[PDB]
Amino acid sequence: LILGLRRCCLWTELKALHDQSQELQDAAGHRQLLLRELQAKQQRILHWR
């Protein structure tokens, strides 16, 4: 009973850890997808100069 209780803790906790880690990695990916526009606009300003 104790071993199965701990297993049922750990498997779903690991799944939730994957879900939250990938959600925040998707947030960081959206952050970098905004960052690419920033650097491209910076080279546009440099070419304007």
Binding site: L35, L38, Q39, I45, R49
Partner: protein, 51 residues
Amino acid sequence: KYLSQEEQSTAALTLYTKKQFFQGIHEVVESSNEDNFQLLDIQTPSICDNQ
């Protein structure tokens, strides 16, 4: 009769600068310096009257 009028036309083309360009250049062109376009290192002090 013509050339001086062109100079007056030239006198037009200067006046749009000091009205707006030497306002606008003094807004973005003067603030397009390379000291404030860097990213992820913003602890450097920007060039402004209120440090």
